[PDB]
């Protein structure tokens, strides 16, 4: 279980830019909540 910082940064970039849950959402706080949830989900998926 050796993971580099670049791996986590790639996870973060995918959650931020390549997130399929941010298609038409424009509210800032709603987008932030979606970003947090997707960050947890994607981090778990990629690490696991």
């Amino acid at each position: 279980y050796q993971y580099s910082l670049q791996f986590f940064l790639d996870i973060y970039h995918n959650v931020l830019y390549e997130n399929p849950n941010l298609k038409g959402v424009t509210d800032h706080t709603q987008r932030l909540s979606i970003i947090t949830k997707d960050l947890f989900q994607v981090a778990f998926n990629r690490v696991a």
Binding site: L5, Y17, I35
Partner: protein
């Protein structure tokens, strides 16, 4: 630094920082594995140019006199014994050893011959980077301002 630094930066940002810092003084990058390491090292010794050597976990013992500064001052000459040949050391010479693997273990002699500079990731730095990234991604105007 008093002893020549050994940099430990997995992210590689420290190497970029060193190259940008010594860009005006004609810094060159090489590696212990490169077959041109010897000629580059002697060129840096003779012309006094900064040198950045990567893959320090493959350390070449040829640098032992250089790291210990075993210079001989005879006849107005400052000589360094690089292997089997004497080279006129330039006072402006400087060397930086680098590695990208934080888990490497060095023999005690090499640890004694260098001073360690560890570029670890701190919580504050990570929080700052993530905050800047999310600000740029979601609030581009705010981040640009």
């Amino acid at each position: 630094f008093n002893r020549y630094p050994l940099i430990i930066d997995p992210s590689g940002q420290a190497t970029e920082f060193i190259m940008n810092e010594y860009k005006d003084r004609k810094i060159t990058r090489t590696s212990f594995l490169d077959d041109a390491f010897r000629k580059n090292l002697e060129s840096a010794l003779r012309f006094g140019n900064p040198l950045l050597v990567q893959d320090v976990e493959s350390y070449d013992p040829v640098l032992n006199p250089v790291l210990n500064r075993e210079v001989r001052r005879t006849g107005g000459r400052v000589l360094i014994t690089l292997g089997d040949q004497d080279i006129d050391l330039s006072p402006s010479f400087v060397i930086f050893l680098s590695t990208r693997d934080p888990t490497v273990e060095f023999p005690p002699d090499l640890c004694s011959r260098v001073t360690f500079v560890n570029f670890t990731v701190t919580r504050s730095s990570l929080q700052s980077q993530c905050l800047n990234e999310v600000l740029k991604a979601e609030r581009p105007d705010v981040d640009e301002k």
